[PDB]
Write a protein that binds this ligand. Sequence first.
Ligand code: NA
Lengths: 416, 416, 415, 415
Amino acid sequence: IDPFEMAVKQLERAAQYMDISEEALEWLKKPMRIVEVSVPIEMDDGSVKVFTGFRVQHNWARGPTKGGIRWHPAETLSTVKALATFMTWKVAVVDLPYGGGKGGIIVNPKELSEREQERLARAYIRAVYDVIGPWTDIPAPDVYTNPKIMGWMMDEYETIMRRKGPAFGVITGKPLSIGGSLGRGTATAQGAIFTIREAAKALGIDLKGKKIAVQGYGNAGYYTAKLAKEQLGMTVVAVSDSRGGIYNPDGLDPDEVLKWKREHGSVKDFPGATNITNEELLELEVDVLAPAAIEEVITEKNADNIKAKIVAEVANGPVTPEADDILREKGILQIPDFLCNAGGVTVSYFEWVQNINGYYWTEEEVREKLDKKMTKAFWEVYNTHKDKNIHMRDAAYVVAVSRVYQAMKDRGWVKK
Amino acid sequence: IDPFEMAVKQLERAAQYMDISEEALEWLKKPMRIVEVSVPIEMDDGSVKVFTGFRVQHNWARGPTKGGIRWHPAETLSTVKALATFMTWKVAVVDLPYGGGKGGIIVNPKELSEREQERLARAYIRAVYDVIGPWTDIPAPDVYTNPKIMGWMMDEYETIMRRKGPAFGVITGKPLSIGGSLGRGTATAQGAIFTIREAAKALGIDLKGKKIAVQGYGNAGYYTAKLAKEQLGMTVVAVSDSRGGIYNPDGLDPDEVLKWKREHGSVKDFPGATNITNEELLELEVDVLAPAAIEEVITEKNADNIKAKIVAEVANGPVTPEADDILREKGILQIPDFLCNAGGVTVSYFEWVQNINGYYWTEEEVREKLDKKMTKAFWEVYNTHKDKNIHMRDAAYVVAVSRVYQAMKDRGWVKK
Amino acid sequence: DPFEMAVKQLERAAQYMDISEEALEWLKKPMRIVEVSVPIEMDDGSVKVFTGFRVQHNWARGPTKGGIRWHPAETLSTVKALATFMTWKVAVVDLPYGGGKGGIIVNPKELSEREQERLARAYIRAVYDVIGPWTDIPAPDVYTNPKIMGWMMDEYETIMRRKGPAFGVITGKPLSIGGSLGRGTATAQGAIFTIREAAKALGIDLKGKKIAVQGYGNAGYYTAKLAKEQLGMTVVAVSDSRGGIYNPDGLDPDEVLKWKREHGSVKDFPGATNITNEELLELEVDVLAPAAIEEVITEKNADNIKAKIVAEVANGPVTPEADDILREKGILQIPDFLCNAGGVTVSYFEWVQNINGYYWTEEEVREKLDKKMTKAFWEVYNTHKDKNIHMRDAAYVVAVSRVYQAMKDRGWVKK
Amino acid sequence: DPFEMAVKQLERAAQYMDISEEALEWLKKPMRIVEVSVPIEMDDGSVKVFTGFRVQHNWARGPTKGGIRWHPAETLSTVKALATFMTWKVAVVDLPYGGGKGGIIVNPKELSEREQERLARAYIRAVYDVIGPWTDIPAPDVYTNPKIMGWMMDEYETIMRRKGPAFGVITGKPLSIGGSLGRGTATAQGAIFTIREAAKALGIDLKGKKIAVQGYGNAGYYTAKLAKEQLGMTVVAVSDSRGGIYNPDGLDPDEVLKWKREHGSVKDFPGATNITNEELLELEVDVLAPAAIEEVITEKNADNIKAKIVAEVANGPVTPEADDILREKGILQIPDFLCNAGGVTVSYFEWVQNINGYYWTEEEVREKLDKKMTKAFWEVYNTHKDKNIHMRDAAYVVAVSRVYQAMKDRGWVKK
Ligand code: NA
């Protein structure tokens, strides 16, 4: 259905830039395994309600499938299939020994007590136990799941598995007490910062004293603005959320803006700044624009008005295929979403490695390994885009799909 | 999802005639587990093609899920979900320690060589291995599958399972050499004959010298006609295939008609018979009319023209909900499909028992146990229809859904 | 103390057979004992940890078999004693089982339905690694019933992922999920077959003879009902804890059960005379069936018993002092773990139906129970005649002999 | 009573931190307790059944870790206490483990080598269903050693059918079959790192400063030798059960060990003068290391201690009355389960090497032991400063806090 058909189209469009057999392309267009389950819980009032849960394993040629669990009332199988498909490319572009998976439950978690949320987390694991495992499929947090829910899920898994293996390794995003990793909270923003540092090096830009704008001020947007200021020495001139943006050409302090948003609900009306719309933030003259909120914010309509030299796609799919052509015609370097935001899954890979090896790393070890991986992935994608004269997004597919295809050939799944 | 929405509607309709909590009804309306998988084969020419496979486990309150695998180019998930739902009622009406399941592959088996069919059978088992087993979910043949395919599937399961358990028990409809049961080929017809015998007793009819017409001349219709003549002493005045019917007031021999159909391609122009339409066959004045071809042949359009005293639903769903009311108002006794045709799953239950117990029964043992089960199930449904003054089909739902609901209550899945 | 008593009775009966000292020392120690935390969240949100136990005393003959008690006074010593007795009871009826038992230290009267379900599931999660249809198969006991067994079977099947016959993990289940016909009456119906065979061994026709029954719980009611309906007896007395009733002409067990439901006691039953439990025990009857409590026939009153057959339906109703006295007086006792073995025998039939995926008629269960209890009776009786020993000691000879022989045939003990 | 004492130290710990009642009650109860028959055939042909224990106190933080004790006085109460204590010891050095302990009631001096192997293999067979490299990982303890760990690993692998990293089922293995470098000196070497960090906390440079060590077994010898060789200390006194020796210009630990091997005691070492154990405890030194027996520093002698640092290498050498007195004197104690955590830390390293199929150098084991003991010392020390409490209470706070957090993060306790 529609998110899934867009994911398949993005794959069909990039496949024109590589030699891939029709048999391999057809395999890559179909998730290998899809599970739809009844997830029953007892409510606080004693009534039993059955929720709909999904787990999708797109492709495990390179290793166990990896990806998060979304709890959302709008949740469809189409969306979970799309995002499992994207996870296959994301883990492959950063060269992880994984495949792509994704899960979800059709629920409004704001209507569930803590007790009901725990009963749902546990019931989900009991419904999908036979297709998950530390060497099979490793979930993680996503929309309206978090380390608290991951702790309950791990606990339930370990109970059913009878402590026979590295049960901590069944799921990532765990609390530190029970096999979590250092660097989880900043992983997505921190990896995007490394990709932005490398894009600047490729363009011959010193980011010290240059300007960034960040669309969105959830965890990812906040940490993107904080880390760009603290690590790259940038000036954060604009941030935004769903209620509007703020602008100050001499810089915002990201911690002070976050404090403001916690007191009043939005960055809007932050003292010393001008209120601006989301559209004006996207059109600002900055060295880096980081769309870190919602999909399809840069499209055919506004692509011509973007002035950023680097668009760091922190959110999933914030730039449409028609906008890709325009930004590239203007000489603007995009960091495609599944490269730019791959820090999240990379640190979750490090967590899993810590779990199956029974040995935990320091914050500095996690950070240097994340840096090497994101730096090497950026250079493979940029070098491919230069050598083949293609859009960065097509280069990202070429790097990723090549690895998945090669694994499928070396297993004999496809004969060519 | 139209076949599935119809099956849910039939449940909702029957639920008015019993005491069942909302929480239990909502649970019974949703299959507990749905799997969609890629089933890849290497074709004889060396290309790899990926087919879509399904396995649905509707409800396992009463025991392992039970139901066949249908290979058809029309196959949809909606159809597999509908038929898995029906299997839950079927196994419960004849009091088997099973729940309902079903599987399918979207394929045209006419276009596959023997070698390709064997690859597809083995690939299906590899794709659904983790959710099947002798105590979990036990498939069987269905449309365009058969004992040859069951043999390949059992063999692949035993290969993966490493002979640790009663691997013959993973699937029924097997060849006799490898754990098959006597009574397999005639089970659906033989069970239907027992229900017809009991329905005639309930109405005070002696079927000896009375007229039967059978619509359809597949295995089920041929054997319904053959056994009605040999065991009940009826005169078979009419049979049909997809092309047309034949009629002879002095009787047709079912073995002769089958030889004619093998020799000339259809029942048409059988010597001495009158050629008739399918509609004319449904309108004959007979004691027993057995629709054993397709679905929805008795509808609001023609229900008023049925003259039979007993309508034996051998096929799954030949009478629509509007026809049910007309036939009942005319005083016509229907033997509802999931009671009338439950002989097939009953003998597959006996095959599974013989496999898990390592001990094989005679022809006469299978036949006597089938007789007692079908006889008892018929009396429970008929007495429920009389005691509550409800349609035979609503009485079949009350007997079946009552047992599944009781299992769900006794496990604590639903509190009321 | 309850464990030390079980050991003493084994030491006692040991004198009546040659058993090596290495085999006797092995039989005196349960092979496995588990004690576990059983945590539940209460309806009010607080987490409480209960104490649970499972004991597998001996598995030489087969998987261990026995129930789970939920009682605020539960001790490990008690669970260990009853696991030991369980090994003898399954052996006396020739079942392919050994003995186990479990319990939780809880007052269930203080738990909601929701809290009880949480506790039943938490117990299975805590003992999962040592239970299974071929390992150790629990059952209902004190404050345990088919409802709780249903919840436990379900939790086990959820952890095991439906890989084997999970129905067979636990007996006393509801009929909807692998229960057996014959469960509700099994103890009474088994007792009745041993009473019928004891009457044959004494040359008595019980048709028109008298029976008294102490207790009008499930076991006492059905013993009275089936003695009347199947054996042809007149039921002259029955009692509960609040006293007894007597009528030399007959009581109708169904009318008394109805009376007892309306009033909460059998007392004042129309047409009959109130009597004490002690006067019930003393009646002149062909059969006395104590099925209420233990130690009701002691040194103190054994000389006042006049029944020709004492059918021990309850556990331990007759003391060892009383045994010598009743036997001196020529009274035939049906010892408890033979007389009441119907329960475990039908729980065996239930396990068989579950592992074979095939269910039996009420008539099939009755007929198999008859043959097993009849054969067990003649083995214990014929042993007591041939070796000239008390029926109780002949029951231990039959039982311990089978357990010992299985331990020798496995090489656990050399001699 | 050993167990009740362990419960009382947990209840004491709860006073220095916010911990829910439901969490405290959970931590007072071992989650799992197993008591098993461990039968062996003696060389003489006779079968004897021994009594074995395995206790898993808490596995919130990871699989349970701890030793097996073979001792004729062994009680379940002791094994429960030591398992409870083990939960805190793995948490203070931040290991991904819970606490367990096991034991057999046996006099090993009465068993031949062939009988000791039969016993080791019989134990693993009896506890197989509750142990494993991700479940519960034993180790040596009283009268068990690497030879017995070898037999026990081998029996586990034979039952498991080589499906997993079976080497990782048990630590203290011989080097040939997955043992670790650093095992023999782990306690002393970890104590040395804590003494180095204690000196840094106090602003003392230990080079040229004096240490006294009570005891001259493996732990006391290596504490003396590593203090001298790595910290640059002068070893002025050591002792054993027969008495102490003193030389203010320093003792060579190897010359004193050769004298003890020849004569039985450090006493009368020609290169020193004799002192009593009490005089050793009262010497003016930067470091005193009690490395022998429990309760040597008491209310009777604590005011006479002059040491700037008391490194508790042995378990329990200082009483709670003495804790208060040394603290009022400004003497810095390194509590036993922090100071001696080198043993369980190197046993964690062995398990890591087993599960990863990759073995470390002596230098790699030492550097990772250094980082772990250094980090643990600073947490305990920072807690004791930040909350103004005794080092021992701060160690309990760091440990219990970690276990509590894992239990909340799992949803075992809601608060
Ligand atoms: Na982030």
